[PDB]
Design a binder for this molecule. Structure first.
Ligand SMILES: CC(=O)SCCNC(=O)CCNC(=O)[C@H](O)C(C)(C)COP(=O)(O)OP(=O)(O)OC[C@H]1O[C@@H](n2cnc3c(N)ncnc32)[C@H](O)[C@@H]1OP(=O)(O)O
Ligand SMILES: CC(=O)SCCNC(=O)CCNC(=O)[C@H](O)C(C)(C)COP(=O)(O)OP(=O)(O)OC[C@H]1O[C@@H](n2cnc3c(N)ncnc32)[C@H](O)[C@@H]1OP(=O)(O)O
Ligand SMILES: CC(=O)SCCNC(=O)CCNC(=O)[C@H](O)C(C)(C)COP(=O)(O)OP(=O)(O)OC[C@H]1O[C@@H](n2cnc3c(N)ncnc32)[C@H](O)[C@@H]1OP(=O)(O)O
Ligand SMILES: O=CCCCC[C@@H]1SC[C@@H]2NC(=O)N[C@@H]21
Ligand SMILES: O=CCCCC[C@@H]1SC[C@@H]2NC(=O)N[C@@H]21
Lengths: 541, 214, 541, 541
């Protein structure tokens, strides 16, 4: 029996209001700017590299991915803004690698492809970080992965950042071994020459496909062999699809053109013999009752103005149906249950500065969801944190610890979205990047940093004032603005969404309009991994 | 009239039984006696009482789930012996029922809040109640008066001591310590008076503007 | 392949036979008497309490239950005859509490509601016993439970029978904690004031709903606080839905009227995210081939006459299809397989005085059913037991022990019905109340006691005769009837079905006509708990 | 490394203080009174029954127990005050049964023996309750059990309280089957005739020993057979050690005199092939630094005066060494770690009226001990409970619920001792009888009831005053003392230690001097059961 009608969230924002107009204009400006940049990134290494790559007869990586996936299906690229102005003068579109999740032969699987157009497929440090992030996502979600190797090797001028360290290059192979150990499939496809970077990968993978001419599997390149052993020989003699197939046996299959390799890959995936099963109650799904684009006028591009979360929730969940939990108590925070694309979810969001009561409410909600095996989604807009003499007297920090412990010990899949400004230890509290959320995204407006620039400028001013007063020449009235200005500027630069997305702190920058769609895709993939028991540490009263 | 009210009241149960039936079909166990719409208690005859809107007047119908499947309803000391069923011609479903030995067939189109009986001789309009808590009037009754979420300096108040109140109008703008928030009018009633003048500060969960009883 | 036709049980009783007429008349008299009494119980505390309860705006408990369950669904009240004339002069309809099982939002769940009309919702000792019995049923069947608290507190004049002992009051909280520990849900709804009895219950439960005015959650009542601490204050300040919601946080939701609370409860149950799954083969079900009411004429109201069990079985099982097991051997007992409402069952019934062979047959049958994971149903009419010098020489007691061991160690769900007179240790043998059957019911005619009155009178006469003869003044010829009469009378009084049902030795008294329906409901609920391995102790040869 | 010296608890009480003299005199009076009563109980049924039991050649039950146990070993009798003035006019020493725990052949095991001297070994309702309590103790502690049957059967004049109900007679057999199912041993020894009560027990047990003449195993007694079947025959033909041994096989061994049966029992226990293993760190043990008898002067016999718990703890734990946990916060309650007889323990005790902070501290302590697998001991002196408008505003009831949940979900062994007055819901909070503590004892001074008599008198006065005022004739100034007096008297009677110990709410009344010794014995037995994981329900913030 499901005949009871339920109240729906959200209202109709006043379009005629000048505030809505202003917010809309700001959000359009940001979205347009993002779109133009993404176009320029997708062009890749540049026209000349494309001309040469075509001249060899290979297919450009974007074309390869389009042919590989089940046609007419969505594909979810990740961290497209990697390496955006990260290095001093070297243009590295997309980090010289394309990674994503797609549906192939009816089974979700992660695709990782080199981009030989960009810098000959050399592994920049960011490239390794991006690839490892993809692999860990696949393992947690328990998804098969496919590699499309056209890489040369590690970037020589930066060897310290690539080779030695634990999380550095080579950890890739370790993950590969662990994946194959616990039945997660591995497939490697070779389209280009490889020198010790794409040489172990086919040997490391269970299955192997190599194109007849353009594919060569060799541990040491012809220049490396010539320089090291004093002997020169073409990589085909060390590599080659036919040469390796007849005698070496490294290649399990022998393809002629790029299309043939893709088709064979589809056949292998079908033969993989895996079936997905769910363990959560499912229901029919319906669209939210309100248009999504209104969010622009609701949110704007200023962190100062405040927007109620429930408006956004109405714009997202199925049918705009929501059941708030302990609404009156701890109003600064919002929790409740909802359904997205027929899947149950628990929504946690921020309205204002946290207090002790909000922390207690969040802890109780987390326990409930973990007990009932319900996925969790976080919408954090932490304009301020819990600071105050009365607050610390009653151990508001202790309540914050309760947030941290509950979030950390949780085992159900967790997804986080940074709708608004994130600062302070609340990032740790509301399932930050460090707390291993399955995904993480940021809207084009959000700014993330440890503290607002003004706060740090004031704090530094005071500490210098106190110590220099102890030194006899206190921080003078002059230099106050001179000292403050650089701190504000630097914090602004480090808080920019592109700046963080240049590194891999986030999985991607998404416009608000696409939000709903992305979430559904993510949750579907996350459901592949079976749910497990959640065990909690000591709950300090 | 009185029979017509009974006919609609039967229709609600039949639609409800069918929708009760549908969820059973998708379920794992479609064989349990619980799925039966009998509504039978142990040693007692279950009775549920309805209220249906009939033009101006609301009418209370007492439905006793009889032991054999017959349906007994009583309105102002007149009882009615009702048995009916639902069958669909084409895509539209007809209600066939007999009331005190008189049977007829009628289209049964059911809206969100209205009951449609269509027949050759005429049509009947019946209205289902809407719970007050579902009507969102209860939502405005949750809070007796406006409360300020956080302590802060009131820049200026949009409403005077005596002023007309419109829906969505803001009571005042209150900015405090790296936060500005705009306080709205809780209810459309004309303000009795404004508690706080310009530049004042009110603590968490504190009254801001007095409003006349609606 | 299921095309083989099967022989069907039962025949057509001769209606014209005067015996059938007599038996029918007796059974009607009993059923009519039961019906009238149940009407009077359902009126509740009386007109005046109903008038006051209405005056406060609350809804009467029966109305509340009708609104709460999925409408147009059966509901199974239990032990309605609790407290029937149990106390000296205090009328306690239904034990001042209504408990039962119902289907809410498509999920079975147990409803427990106080009846503030009856004696202000005070907990009489029987009330605690009834409630605890309900809770243990829910835990074994693994069902969510919902409380509707409108209770004041324990009955002061009887505090010894309520507070201290292990199975006494307070064990309720222990069960609640265990239930919530192993994921069985708990929901508490508050409609009336509570003083330390309904105060811990909302705190003990995971979810909480309280009506705006009539609901007040407070550990100590205004008179208790005034008498104890010398300070007086209204219970609303200690309780109150708004007061507790804004600050205390005891209330997870805030409802306005009684209907609103019920509707919110439905929403929570839907969000609970549980799915029922079966682990037994299921088949289409069809009605038995014979009318049920014939049982009256078959059975009558005299324990002396005998009726074959197979007649009753034909009146019950689906299609009146039955497959007797080892029919010729141990004919005094009947076992076999059948199907009820599409579920497989194993029927065990009594025809006469048990013997050694019957015990062996029963033990073998129990082992088979336990091995194949088939539920068991018992129909005991133990007119006599196994007593005799030759019987005890071959250890007929030992065979009875085999019955006891097999029944006790069994793990599949078991249901028992007392169709006829139950006496002696056979009650222990055929899954008595002590042996934890999931349910237990008695027909209006059955009489249960340790021994028939005549037997005890004779035994007491002999022992007094022997000892007094040793005393020199033997039990004279006089006083024999004078001594016998009180024993017969007392055993008759203690054996009455109402007398036992006044206590909670049985789950309810049901007329034979409804029998089939009730069984199906019970078994469906019992299937929620997953079946487990059955381990047997030492089988003494 | 264990060389750090530790501060020791306790001081030297001022003996010369008149208060110490007064307290000492009171405690002596109580202890003397208890000793005299226990003497009178141990005499048993009386001289004449002893003379007859000797005349048959049997050994008196006390003699049997002394011979059976490993000689020169302690033995721990339980609930000796059962049936103390419980019935109207029937003297039932020791409940007509002797139960206890002892060390036999190096293995702890529970001994249960009938007392045929007292009322022919009939099972009074209290007798069944006592026996079942013993069995549940054995199963939780996972100990072998031995029965010494000399019983006739259930007490006929009270058959309602014995036969039918779930926890009534016959549940014994169910426990026996479960015990034998999970490898817990069962041994039955027969010294006297048995009629359907001690008839199934040998058949139910794995091993069996019966004396040649005085032992007869028969399901139905000669008077029962004669009255029922119309056939008379001596119980020896149905029973008899030789008769059953040669043909029936019910008796696995055949003993001549009582001593022979005891000796054979020792042999069987040795052959049982069980070895005890511990799973907790153990250390050398030393006596407490102060004499135990000082407790008398410390405690006295008045509930009004207060004594610090730490004095008692110093009198108990090994070396009077203690490490208080969070001492300053929540001072009204005391928690810490200590060692008794080389075993680690966690001590929880009460000093005064509970508050919210104390509840939080207790919850945190419980979590720690459960995590580290440390047994828990409770010393409750609850003079008052948590009641107050400010207390209930902050949900002091909610904190009490946290106490309840933590205690209930705990899985480590728990022992409770009622040093002082116990009242209110705190009994539930500090591991009351209902919460299944492995043991429970009360000092001779303690009084237990739901509420103090004065409180209930005041509350009843107010409620009658209010309602009668509504009735127009309020509770007058007269009758106030007339109404109060009976309530005070009745609560005093129900709170007496002997009154509670007459029933089985407690395991025994022990003088303070013996306290330490008893605890050690209990904990040693409790260590037989392997420790298990502790799982906690929802921790309502
Ligand atoms: C693991 C090791 O340290 S072994 C590394 C040494 N081996 C190599 O990588 C050899 C160079 N790479 C190759 O030739 C690969 O086999 C190929 C075929 C995939 C690359 O194909 P090509 O594009 O023809 O190679 P090419 O040398 O033209 O690469 C283009 C650019 O990438 C750079 N590059 C490619 N691989 C590397 C590398 N491993 N380290 C540093 N730079 C590299 C080159 O400097 C070159 O400069 P440019 O981008 O400014 O023109
Ligand atoms: C757990 C403890 O022992 S502490 C409990 C002490 N506190 C109380 O319960 C005070 C009594 N409470 C009450 O008066 C009521 O139960 C209320 C106020 C909660 C609401 O109950 P109502 O339905 O309004 O009943 P009302 O107040 O009219 O009358 C109380 C009746 O309930 C009975 N009752 C209810 N609770 C108790 C109790 N704890 N002890 C004794 N009797 C009680 C009384 O006998 C009385 O009987 P009556 O019907 O003959 O008058
Ligand atoms: C399980 C059942 O309901 S079947 C029970 C019926 N069977 C019986 O036990 C009948 C009574 N049998 C007896 O007389 C004894 O129990 C015997 C013969 C087995 C042994 O008892 P003894 O220790 O020799 O006592 P004795 O026979 O001298 O006297 C019997 C006494 O025990 C009491 N008694 C023993 N068993 C029972 C019983 N089942 N019911 C009632 N009273 C009993 C009698 O009241 C009598 O009381 P007394 O102590 O004031 O004299
Ligand atoms: O004459 C009446 C005495 C009742 C006899 C009861 C019979 S005898 C054999 C069987 N065993 C019992 O316990 N009851 C029946
Ligand atoms: O004057 C005598 C009344 C007894 C007071 C008992 C105190 S009051 C606060 C505390 N709570 C209780 O239940 N008892 C104590």
């Amino acid at each position: 029996y499901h005949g009871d009608s339920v109240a729906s969230l959200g209202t109709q924002p006043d379009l005629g209001s000048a505030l809505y107009q202003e917010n809309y204009k700001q959000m359009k400006a940001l979205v347009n700017q993002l779109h133009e940049r993404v176009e320029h990134i997708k062009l890749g290494g540049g026209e000349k590299a494309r001309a040469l790559h075509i001249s060899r007869g290979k297919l450009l990586p974007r074309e390869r991915i389009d042919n590989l996936i089940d046609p007419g299906s969505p594909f979810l690229e990740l961290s497209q803004f990697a390496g955006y102005q990260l290095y001093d003068n070297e243009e590295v579109p997309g980090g010289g690698i394309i990674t994503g999740i797609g549906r192939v032969s009816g089974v979700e699987c992660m695709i990782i492809a080199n981009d030989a157009t960009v810098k000959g497929g050399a592994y920049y440090p960011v490239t390794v970080k991006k690839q490892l992030r993809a692999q860990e996502i696949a393992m947690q979600n328990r998804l098969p992965c496919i590699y499309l190797v056209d890489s040369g090797g590690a970037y020589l001028p930066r060897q310290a950042d690539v080779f030695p360290d634990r999380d550095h290059f080579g950890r890739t192979f370790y993950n590969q071994a662990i994946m194959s150990s616990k039945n997660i499939a591995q497939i490697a496809v070779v389209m280009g020459s490889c020198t010790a970077g794409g040489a172990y990968v086919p040997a490391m993978a269970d299955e192997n496909i190599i194109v007849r001419k353009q594919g060569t599997i060799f541990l040491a390149g012809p220049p490396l062999v010539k320089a090291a052993t004093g002997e020169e020989v073409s990589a085909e003699d060390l590599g080659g699809a036919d040469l390796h197939c007849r005698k070496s046996g490294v290649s399990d299959h022998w393809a002629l053109d790029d299309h043939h390799a893709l088709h064979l890959t589809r056949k292998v995936v079908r033969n993989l013999n895996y079936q997905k099963k769910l363990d959560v109650t499912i229901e029919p799904s319906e669209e939210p009752l309100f248009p999504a684009d209104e969010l622009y006028g609701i949110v704007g591009a200023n962190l100062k103005r405040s927007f109620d979360v429930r408006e956004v929730i109405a714009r997202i969940v199925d049918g705009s149906r929501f059941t708030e939990f302990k609404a009156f108590y701890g109003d600064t925070l919002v929790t409740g249950f909802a359904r997205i694309f027929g899947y149950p979810v628990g929504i946690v969001g921020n309205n204002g500065v946290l207090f002790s009561e909000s922390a207690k409410k969040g802890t109780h909600f987390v326990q409930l969801c973990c007990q009932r095996n319900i996925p969790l989604l976080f919408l954090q807009n932490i304009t301020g944190f819990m600071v105050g003499r009365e607050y610390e007297a009653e151990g508001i920090a202790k309540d914050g610890a309760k947030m941290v412990a509950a979030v950390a010990c949780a085992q159900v899949p967790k997804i986080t979205l940074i709708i608004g400004g994130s600062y302070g230890a609340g990032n740790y509290g509301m399932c930050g990047r460090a707390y291993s959320p399955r995904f993480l995204y940021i809207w084009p407006n959000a700014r993330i940093s440890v503290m607002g620039g003004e706060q740090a400028a004031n704090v530094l001013a005071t500490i210098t004032k106190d110590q220099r007063a102890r030194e006899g020449k206190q921080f003078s009235s002059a230099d106050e603005a001179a000292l403050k200005e650089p701190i504000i500027k630097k914090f602004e630069e480090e808080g920019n969404p592109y700046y963080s997305s240049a590194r891999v702190w986030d999985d991607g920058i998404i416009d608000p309009a696409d939000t709903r769609l992305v979430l559904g895709l993510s949750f579907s993939a996350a459901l592949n991994a079976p749910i497990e028991k959640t065990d909690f540490g000591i709950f300090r009263m | 009239a009185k029979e017509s009210l009974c006919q609609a009241a039967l229709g609600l149960i039949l639609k409800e039984k069918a929708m009760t039936d549908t969820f059973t079909l998708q379920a794992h166990d479609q064989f349990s006696p619980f799925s039966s719409s009998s509504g039978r208690r142990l040693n007692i005859s279950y009775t549920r009482n309805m209220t249906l809107k009939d033009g101006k007047n609301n009418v209370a119908i007492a439905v006793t789930y009889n032991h054999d499947g017959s349906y007994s309803m009583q309105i102002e000391d007149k009882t009615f012996q009702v048995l009916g069923n639902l069958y669909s011609e084409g895509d539209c479903t007809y209600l066939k029922c007999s009331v005190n030995g008189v049977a007829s067939k009628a289209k049964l189109i059911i809206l969100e809040n209205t009951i449609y009986l269509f027949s050759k001789e005429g049509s009947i309009e019946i209205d289902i109640p809407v719970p007050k808590y579902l009507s969102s009037v209860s939502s405005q009754e949750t809070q007796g008066g406006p409360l300020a979420p956080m302590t802060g300096t009131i820049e200026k108040v949009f409403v005077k001591a005596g002023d007309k109140v419109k829906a969505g109008d803001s009571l005042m703008v209150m900015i405090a310590m790296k936060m500005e928030h705009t306080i709205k009018s809780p209810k459309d009633g004309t303000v009795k008076k404004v508690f706080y003048r310009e530049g004042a500060q009110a603590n968490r969960h504190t009254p801001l503007v007095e409003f006349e009883e609606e």
